[PDB]
């Protein structure tokens, strides 16, 4: 499943909330939480946060 998966940002995403994970296309993200609704939580490098699940793709 996506939980615990490693995905890659397909598009740049700029957080709109402090708990969101900004990232650039190509960024590798570790999915740490999956919720239905368009957002997952995960980490990229030293950052953590929610991000649009449709902004990433499985590697």
């Amino acid at each position: 499943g996506p939980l615990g998966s490693v995905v890659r940002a397909k598009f740049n995403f700029q957080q709109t909330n402090e708990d969101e994970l900004s990232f650039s296309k190509g960024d590798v993200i570790h999915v740490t939480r999956v919720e239905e609704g368009g957002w997952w939580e995960g980490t990229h490098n030293g950052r953590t946060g929610w991000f649009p699940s449709n902004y990433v793709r499985e590697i």
Partner: peptide
């Protein structure tokens, strides 16, 4: 870029500050 759904409440916490 793709459409970003509004943050669902079930993904929010007191840390969901804008």
């Amino acid at each position: 870029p793709p459409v970003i759904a509004p943050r669902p409440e079930h993904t929010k916490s007191i840390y969901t500050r804008s």
